[PDB]
Each structure stands twice: as C-alpha cells, then as structure tokens.
Amino acid sequence: LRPKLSEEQQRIIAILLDAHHKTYDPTYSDFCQFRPPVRVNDGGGSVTLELSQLSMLPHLADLVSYSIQKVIGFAKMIPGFRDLTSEDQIVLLKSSAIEVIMLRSNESFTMDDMSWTCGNQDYKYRVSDVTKAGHSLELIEPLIKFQVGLKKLNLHEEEHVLLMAICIVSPDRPGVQDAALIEAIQDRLSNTLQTYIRCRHPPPLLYAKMIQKLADLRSLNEEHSKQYRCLSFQPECSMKLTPLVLEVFG
Ligand SMILES: C=C1/C(=C\C=C2/CCC[C@]3(C)[C@@H]([C@H](C)CCCC(C)(C)O)CC[C@@H]23)C[C@@H](O)[C@@H](OCCCO)[C@@H]1O
C-alpha cells in the first residue's frame, strides 16, 4: 500500500525543508569568520606532533561550534520539539549534536576526492586535517565510510531533513525524562518518512538503510566521545575549543 502524504505530513516536510534552508548555508559564507585553518607538516601522521600543535583544532572547533548553533536552530523548528520540556530539549540536543553534524556534513562531502569541500582549498577538509585536530583513524576512517554509504543512498532533501529530525528526537538517549512524548514526536516523523519513501521515491529497503545509518551514528558518537576525552587532556586544549563545544562534549 502506498497511502498519500496527509496534509499534516506535507506541512511537517515543508517546515523541515524551510528549517534546513534557514540553518544550512550551502555557500559556507561564514567560514572566513572562524579561526583560520593551519596545516602543520605531518606527512607521518605523528600523534605526538598532532597533540603538540592541534593546528586544525581552532578552525574545526569553530566550525563544529557554529554547526551546533545551526542544529539548535533546526531542532527548535521540528514540529513537536517545543512541546518537550526545556530539560528534555537540552538532553536531546547534547546527545545528538555530533551525529546531526556528521549527517548534515554529507552535503559538503564529495566522492570526487573523499573530502568535505566547503568552497576554496582553505575550507577543504580531508582525513589529514582531522588528524591535525587531535582525532585518530579509529574515528575518521569509519566516518568517511559512513559519508560514502550515506551519499550512495541518494536521499531526496525531504528524506535528509526527516532523518536529521528523527536522529535528534530519539527516546533512547540517556537522561530523557518524557521518553513517551519524545517517542510520539519521533513516530510522527518516522511515519512521515516511511510514507514519503513509499509514494515519492522511484525504484530501485531505503527506510531500513536509513535506520541502519542511525545505528552507525551511535557507534561514531561513542568513538568521538572517547577521542574528545583524550583531546581534552591536552594542556591548553580548552582555549582551542569554544564554551559551547566544551559544554556539549564535556
Ligand atoms: C561540520 C560540518 C562540515 C564538515 C564536517 C566534518 C569535516 C571535518 C571533521 C568533522 C568536523 C568531524 C570531527 C570528528 C569532529 C571533531 C570535533 C572536535 C570538537 C574537535 O572533537 C565530524 C564531522 C566532520 C562542513 C559543512 O558541511 C557544515 O555545514 C555547513 C554549515 C551550515 O550550518 C557541517 O555542519
């Protein structure tokens, strides 16, 4: 059966597309405002050297902090999110921020050279730039794999914005109080996505592939948390981060 999208489901999709267009600048025009990227000579991928310099960390921490602000704005526009308590809104935002950043970065990700290309060569991020921010291959290589797997799903922007909304409104996040209300909001979004795929997505399992990405994101989130903890032990690291980043990942 291929039921048509209800008027409500159509409205949810319109709101989410509008929220994404207002919070995701595909020209990356604010990037000149971040602390500049610095690429030290590290052809050897030396952990000692990367931690000593953390040359890409101020730029990527500013990029991520800016992105977290955009994700907060997006989340606030998800139909039903404002019905949650302020406490549950913050729990969901803090636990999903890194996953939504990984999802939304797929728009700048390119399979041409396996990089996140945000305009000119200065704002092109490769595996080597992430190692220069203090992260290791145990996070970066599965993250690149995830990006390619997501790129190959060829999501319609409707499916992309619904996936990010479903990711944020997850009832199984530690510390959530009203799990039943969060689950009702998520089911409303999941049914919208399932209905959209069934009547708008041409041929040639897409919903199950999208739900598998959400599970992959949990593993990536856990690895990022372990790595962030290591990064945080580096003396003077806090100055290379931002107050928002420190709070979200602390
Ligand atoms: C962020 C965005 C972009 C890329 C994301 C990347 C590439 C560099 C390395 C990142 C930032 C990974 C790092 C492992 C995270 C490390 C973080 C610390 C704190 C250092 O532990 C996770 C996501 C990866 C660019 C652009 O798509 C932004 O979208 C355009 C902007 C519209 O708002 C988006 O949001």
Swiss-Prot record:
It is found in: Nucleus; Cytoplasm. A motif (9aaTAD) lies at residues 243-250. Keywords: Cytoplasm, Disease variant, DNA-binding, Metal-binding, Nucleus, Receptor, Transcription, Transcription regulation, Ubl conjugation, Zinc, Zinc-finger. Ubiquitinated by UBR5, leading to its degradation: UBR5 specifically recognizes and binds ligand-bound VDR when it is not associated with coactivators (NCOAs). In presence of NCOAs, the UBR5-degron is not accessible, preventing its ubiquitination and degradation. The keyword Oxidoreductase does not apply. The gene is VDR. GO terms for molecular function: bile acid nuclear receptor activity; calcitriol binding; DNA binding; DNA-binding transcription factor activity, RNA polymerase II-specific; lithocholic acid binding; nuclear receptor activity; nuclear retinoid X receptor binding; nuclear steroid receptor activity. It is linked to Rickets vitamin D-dependent 2A: A disorder of vitamin D metabolism resulting in severe rickets, hypocalcemia and secondary hyperparathyroidism. Most patients have total alopecia in addition to rickets. Coiled coil: none annotated. It comes from Homo sapiens (Human). The keyword Secreted does not apply. Changing residue 190 to P: In VDDR2A; loss of calcitriol receptor activity; loss of affinity for calcitriol; decreased ligand-independent localization to the nucleus; loss of interaction with RXRA; loss of interaction with NCOR1; loss of interaction with NCOA1; loss of sequence-specific DNA-binding. Changing residue 176 to M: In VDDR2A; decreased calcitriol receptor activity; decreased affinity for calcitriol; decreased ligand-independent localization to the nucleus; loss of interaction with RXRA; decreased interaction with NCOR1; decreased interaction with NCOA1; decreased sequence-specific DNA-binding. Belongs to the nuclear hormone receptor family. NR1 subfamily. Nuclear receptor for calcitriol, the active form of vitamin D3 which mediates the action of this vitamin on cells. Enters the nucleus upon vitamin D3 binding where it forms heterodimers with the retinoid X receptor/RXR. The VDR-RXR heterodimers bind to specific response elements on DNA and activate the transcription of vitamin D3-responsive target genes. Plays a central role in calcium homeostasis. Also functions as a receptor for the secondary bile acid lithocholic acid (LCA) and its metabolites. Composed of three domains: a modulating N-terminal domain, a DNA-binding domain and a C-terminal ligand-binding domain. The 9aaTAD motif is a transactivation domain present in a large number of yeast and animal transcription factors. This is Vitamin D3 receptor. GO terms for cellular component: chromatin; cytosol; nucleoplasm; nucleus; receptor complex; RNA polymerase II transcription regulator complex. Residues 76-94 are annotated as: Interaction with coactivator LXXLL motif. Calcitriol binds at residues 24, 67, 104, 108, 135, 224. Residues 8-250 form the NR LBD domain. The chain holds residues 120 to 423 of 427 of the full protein. GO terms for biological process: apoptotic process involved in mammary gland involution; calcium ion transport; cell differentiation; cell morphogenesis; decidualization; intestinal absorption; intracellular calcium ion homeostasis; intracellular receptor signaling pathway.
